[model samples]
Target: PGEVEMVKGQPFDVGPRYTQLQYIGEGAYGMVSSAYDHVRKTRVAIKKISPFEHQTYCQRTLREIQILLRFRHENVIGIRDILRASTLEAMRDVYIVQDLMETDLYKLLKSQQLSNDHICYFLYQILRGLKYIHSANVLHRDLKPSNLLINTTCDLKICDFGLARIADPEHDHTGFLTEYVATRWYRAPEIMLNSKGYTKSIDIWSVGCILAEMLSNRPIFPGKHYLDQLNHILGILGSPSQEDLNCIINMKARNYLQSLPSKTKVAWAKLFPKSDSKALDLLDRMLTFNPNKRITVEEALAHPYLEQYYDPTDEPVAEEPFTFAMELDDLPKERLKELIFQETARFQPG
Candidate 1:
């Protein structure tokens, strides 16, 4: 319940308009703070990104800025404003002025007990947010409780688009397994088994994983490693059919799975004894081995579990699909920084 303000008014910082800064925390991207936007007369969270330090960092910042600027759904996190140095030489960090949230869902889950309705409402928002993102042909890639920001009223927004990919036509399952194994427990079978291709169904499985964790207040599949992660999924959801197994592009993993003892599907009620039947049913629809068999976001939203919160008219889609701005270029860090600087400066007047 304490706050500390960062040193003010240097080229390497958030501008003067943002005041009353309190250091919130730091992420892979940058240090974040809750600040008052005096210019807009509102409170906001500012992410001070030292992007040019690494090419990967710059790319991530560019990607997040690109996606958030275009995405307007209520459940999708919004940027309130942006801050940057005018001169390219002066630009060392980029400040993202994002709408503030009290805490993320990950922290809330650890801190308190949640009722079934609370869980339902949160799941509804996650699905609603995903509906818009997927409609824009984007893949979140990294969806977990930590990536879902929450407020006191249980209003949830999907956060962290840095790991998102456009789910473009060019590639299917290339390099998806590399470098980003952040949350294997929430990862779907295809990504886990290195399937040649994947779809929006991967994000749907994360929602199911999150739902199960909320229902029981722990990760349903706390696998020690990737193999154990698969074991966890196969044990609960049961072994995949031969056709599904055949989808595993990693032939060695497929043979090893075939060699292991086959598993039977665990009944939903036994796993979530106190959960509403509809919730269990939705889980059954969402958590499946074959990405082909997994429920689409449309079906998941329509499922009886989410009916109370689902409104056909209210859950709107993005008008235009979010297209990338050549962020994945072979450009150097300096050029990336310039690109990022130009982006943030686009938000402010000359």
Candidate 2:
């Protein structure tokens, strides 16, 4: 408790080697605080979470830790250290320390006007991180602007793997998956329809959504709900063809798409009047309705829009799912802490 600062008008000692400076933000899972890490001789962002009530929260924290441990790339946030209470009776929260950025892409989008170069550079970094994630056969189901961490230098790092899952090549089941996994606007059409055989292309759709928003400073498919989301997409891209509809295995969903108004594709120039042809072309491929036709992360990185800045060397190398959610859901709090402890132990210096 050597160094400490007040958070929300109350004093909370973060740890012996750090001082809590100020509260950054809070969400359902936890709050992030700006802190100084004396041991590392630098400032850092600390994500503090208490999972005493929500079992899902604890499971998510563990999953994120495990995923971040395996990720090694410039565009992916790195976990520097973790702090937890010492005893089972007192262990109630966790402090996750990592690199701090000036703001996230969500906030940045609201504050500034990005040039074409800025947009291309930011999107390239996203694809780079995503290429690495997909190479490992991981699906970052949630890839909205808020989850993209960025600084003044225009560097973007993808964060928040709480909703991510390991790609099971042989298992194509959506019955057990949550309907509200990714954010509504950025959620893919296949996910919106609850497709059983969805693939990594879901992430590509999200990337398309984010890129479109970056261009216009507003979400392209800003749907109010699941149904409304589908309407927004169809309204822009027009109703999917019979081939695309057939790929939608859900009978009700397929029929629902067939029932919608027969519409024509909106011109890309109308959608992005100021965007160059290169950006529009890449966006078109990414925003494809059919998952099979949708561009892959690797393909997106190689697109003409990013080719000028792209380097094959920056591509994330493909690597490598544990069903942590199912297994940790019913465990007692003490047992959960033990599992987290084991995972954190691996990060310690020998």
Candidate 3:
């Protein structure tokens, strides 16, 4: 927007105050790098965007930043700042700075080391984060291990909102469908089967898969194709019924299995053979074939496993109706106004 400034007292002055360092990760949109915030004297995660990536995902990236701006919770990903617009090498760029954590859950699993308490605490934080996000009327279409960050203390932080969407407000049929939004393995039955106007429940389905992955210490769906994904699911949960096929008409792989009328939980017991019954029970409820029958995030928080493992009393009660919106207060006033304006304009009568 204006003259770009630098974080003082540094040798090589890059655009933003933070000194951008080596690359940490990359995605279709852009790459994330570790940066040293000289002003704050702490490391931060900087998501960098080049014009090529900017042209492709700027709208959703900004929307994601706007959506994430409102949320401020210990259990949610924390944001530091959004550097005002700048250009680099003939390409427009925006640096999104966030608290730098040690590693993601995927890396942790790769190490093949996690205590039971560590797993419980991480899953609990995930549930809390999902509950907060859903309360804001948003859906994180992507909820895999890679999107979650963790540190030595085992604090879990959810990240990467580029794939998230403002959930459909009206629950009734509106004749619109989202693209195959979530990853294949974590995608919900409703989305996979093309149910009419799904809701935040789709995220819950993904969470179920993630939770399973945590316990098993392996990729829940190592398969790459649709049939492979389904076989992986059925290999654990058994096949869906005629009613399941009727309800989820969009599943192209439904034909592969239709003889079973009733679904069984044998696979769950086999997978989590040593896990607490409460954990297995909740997992069962979460991974249900029928989307309508799937448990809600609120219900999931109340599930025995969570009730037994999590301590909500320790969290801040001042944040009533905990939501992701609590993280958005640091944006410039005009940018805040612009976000409100956009959301308002979307609702205005044509």
Candidate 4:
């Protein structure tokens, strides 16, 4: 590790070549450390894979590394290096280096609220990132606020490629074999109904949830169970018809969604109350109940909402970044639990 100093009041500057500072946080099986970078001279972040009881840890870690190697873009997180896996080592550790960011989109929304314009700004960036992923034939099956990272200047970079897969258009499916991979609140109806034979538009549904969360300053559907999550989604987007439910033959909970509400266009009318009608229209198109009818990332970028607030060539100005509920480093365990609870709760008629 090289000697690197923190810039101003920001976090560790662990380099494209920086120094390890302190343990920031970790997952059930791994930990992330805050570090400083000597070469780039800025506070950067890194996630390390500690020894785990799971036998497939190496395979999963390598899977992540392989996926990252296939693509590089400003919006998508890049793997700076993967530690370990050399000669003469019985067991090895893995490190994933990504540009250090001020906080995640969830953390930002948790503490401080966002203005209408602020919501537009983030959604615009996120769509740009998704467009890149789709264009490259990759599917970010897992799309949530935590995966969306923001740098010191509030540049949003999509992180966590552990669940991403290479998109194969010839096949009817998007390679999202498991129904449980995505965060409950952000989970798409198609995934809930049909895990197989779904299209890349699944991420667009997640984007709808993310955008709604950004605007509302809280998770749109923090359901206590899957049923509860469905109720939440139906409350906003209305439930899919009996005909639509039949498409998801592989879904385990197919019998649960007994009935749906009348269509009210919740995402458009409620979520973006003051947003331009055109922007709201595009949002609805992306989250259409019929996955086949759902719009693609390319079409989403062409929407009026994006062009109205976002500029591809123009540089973002320095302004006050959005604040969050908890400290950047201190994660709230109960908050996550609540989300899971709502996700697992059985769906009931509303």
Q: How well is each residue in 1-350 modelled by candidate 2, as lDDT tens digits? A: 46457677544457677775788887786888888788888889988777756666766777788888878888989898887666546667777888998899999889877899999999999999888888877788889999999987878889988777776545554531236656889877776676533378888999999999999999999998777887888889997888987776776777777887788889989978889889999999999988889888878887889978789964748555333344555787667667777777654431
Q: Clashes per prediction?
A: 0, 1, 13, 32
Instruction: Give TM per candidate.
Output: 0.91, 0.91, 0.77, 0.73
Clashing pairs in 1: none
**Which window of 10 residues has the lowest lDDT sum in candidate 4?**
317-326
Instruction: Rank by lDDT, highest first.
Output: 2, 1, 3, 4
RMSD of every prediction? 3.3, 2.7, 7.5, 12.7
Error of 4 at 85 (Å): 5.9
Worst 10 residues of 1 by lDDT: 1-10
Regions more than 4 Å wrong, model 4: 1-20, 51-56, 88-90, 168-179, 239-267, 271-276, 309-350
* lDDT (10s digit) by residue, model 4, range 281-342: 77678767777788877677777777774555532221221111213114343333233233
Cα-based lDDT at residue 299, candidate 1: 93
Q: For model 3, state the Cα shift of residue 69 in Å.
A: 1.1
- In candidate 3 the C-alpha lDDT for residue 102 amounts to 92
Off by over 4 Å in 1: 1-12, 174-182, 196-198, 325-329
Predicted candidate 3 versus true structure: per-residue lDDT over 1-350, tens digit per residue: 22233323212223446664756777765677777787788888877644223322544565566666767767678667665322223224455678888999999898885666776778888988887777766777789999999987888888887667656535423211334545677765455345432377778878888888888887666658654665566666666666766754433444445643455646677767877677778888888877778898878877777765555555432233323332343555445434534442322221
lDDT of 1 at 38: 73
Which candidate comes out best when scored by TM-score? 2
